[PDB]
Design a protein around this ligand. Structure first.
Ligand code: 2CQ
Length: 150
């Protein structure tokens, strides 16, 4: 009974979360997961500002309304070489990573590690936050509020 959450630096409060090392988050789980970080799904405008401060990934994730990949540098294997906030148009499937937005984060790039999951609820799952530098924070809890996600 374990969930691992790989997290990134924050850029203007926006960060990326990947669950269990693969695309595995539904839209409802995404919202609940951001909730556990005292965060929300970013708006498009919040994502564009994060982009402008240096945020890019090579992974699809939810924002409010769409599934996107922020890209600064063109790369042929990330969002088909596009730059900007690339919006997924056509897909059969429903599970992605997520982006989250924490209003209390610093305004520009914050590449310190995440050391807490402040708004998790009581529960039986060992949840481990894994930072890009390998540092880890664990706690027992739950964040999913929808039966179909559990
Ligand atoms: C929820 C949260 C916790 C910590 N420690 C940091 N550093 C960043 C975020 Cl977004």
């Amino acid at each position: 009974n374990q969930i691992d959450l790989n997290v990134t630096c924050r850029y203007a409060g926006v960060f990326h979360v990947e669950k269990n090392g693969r695309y595995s988050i539904s839209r409802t789980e995404a919202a609940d997961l951001c909730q556990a970080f005292n965060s929300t799904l970013p708006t498009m405008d919040q994502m564009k500002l994060a982009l402008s401060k240096g945020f890019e990934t090579c992974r699809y994730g939810f924002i409010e309304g769409n599934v996107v990949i922020p890209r600064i540098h063109p790369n042929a294997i990330c969002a088909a070489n596009h730059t900007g906030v690339y919006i997924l148009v056509t897909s059969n499937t429903s599970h992605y990573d997520t982006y989250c937005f924490n209003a209390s984060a610093p305004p520009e790039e914050d590449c310190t590690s995440v050391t807490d999951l402040p708004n998790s609820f009581d529960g039986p799952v060992t949840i481990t936050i894994v930072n890009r530098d390998g540092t880890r924070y664990s706690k027992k809890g739950e964040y999913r509020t929808h039966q179909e996600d559990i």
